[PDB]
């Protein structure tokens, strides 16, 4: 398997069209693909574009 990038929403977002993904603050979104300022997210079995400046990538700096 591969570990995909995951991000945590900093602010909520309402999708502007069917191809975007809405989310609330704190949501943990999996990233399937990147296109400059928009990332393709997956959350609760739904997939759509999200603005990357609404979220913060979760990085593991250290072994647990």
Task: Give the residue extent of every domain in the chain.
Answer: 1-64
How far separated are the first and last CA of the chain, in Å rounded? 19
Diameter over CA atoms, the chain: 40
DSSP 1-62: --PPPEEEESS-B--SSTTB--B-TT-EEEEEEEETTEEEEEETTEEEEEEGGGEEEE---S
Instruction: Kindly provide the resolution of this structure in angstroms, with one decimal.
Output: 1.7
Cβ–Cβ under 8 Å, residues 24 and 55: no
3-21 CB burial, b ≥16 within 10 A, e <16: eeeebebeeebeeeeeebb
Tell me the β-bridge partners of 13.
23
For residue 63, the SS3 value is coil
The values of phi and psi at residue 58, to 5°, are -100, 120
For 35, how many CA atoms within 13 A lie in the half-sphere containing its CB?
9
| CATH superfamily, with its number, for domain 1-64 | SH3 Domains (2.30.30.40)
């Amino acid at each position: 398997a591969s570990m995909l990038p995951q991000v945590k929403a900093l602010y909520p977002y309402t999708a502007a069209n069917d191809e975007e993904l809405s989310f609330k603050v704190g949501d943990i979104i999996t990233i399937l693909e990147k296109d400059e300022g928009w990332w393709k997210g997956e959350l609760n079995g739904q997939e759509g574009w999200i603005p990357n400046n609404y979220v913060k990538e979760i990085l593991e700096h250290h072994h647990h």
